[PDB]
Each structure stands twice: as C-alpha cells, then as structure tokens.
Amino acid sequence: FSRLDKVEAEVQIDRLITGRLQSLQTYVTQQLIRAAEIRASANLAATKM
C-alpha cells in the first residue's frame, strides 16, 4: 500500500486474499469432515454406554 498505486496494488492484494480465502475454505471443509467423524464415534460411544 505504501509502495504501489491503489489500482495497481488492487490486483496484488486481490490475488493474496483469493489465496487466503481458498486456504480458509479448505481448512473449514477439513474441520467439518473431522466433526462428522467425531459425531459418528460419539454416537457409537453413547450406544456402548
């Protein structure tokens, strides 16, 4: 921001934020899969209890 013009730095910061949102979305999806697996294991543990 302090080195480039706003319209020129807009493309670079757009690339950066697209990468960061992609990484965050992948993390959220992996967390959801792990949560589903833990939910199934908890149901099995509840049946055992």
Q: Considering the complex, what minimum distance in angstroms separates the CB of residue 32 from a second copy?
A: 6
- Whether the CB-CB separation of 1 and 9 falls below 8 Å is answered with yes
Within 8 A by CB and 6+ apart from 4, the residues are 12
Per-residue interface string for the shown chain with a second copy, residues 4-33, x marking contact by CB under 8 A:
----------xx--x---x--xx--x--xx
Q: Considering the complex, what minimum distance in angstroms separates the CB of residue 2 from a second copy?
A: 23
Sites of contact with a second copy (CB under 8 A): 14-15, 18, 22, 25-26, 29, 32-33, 36-37, 40
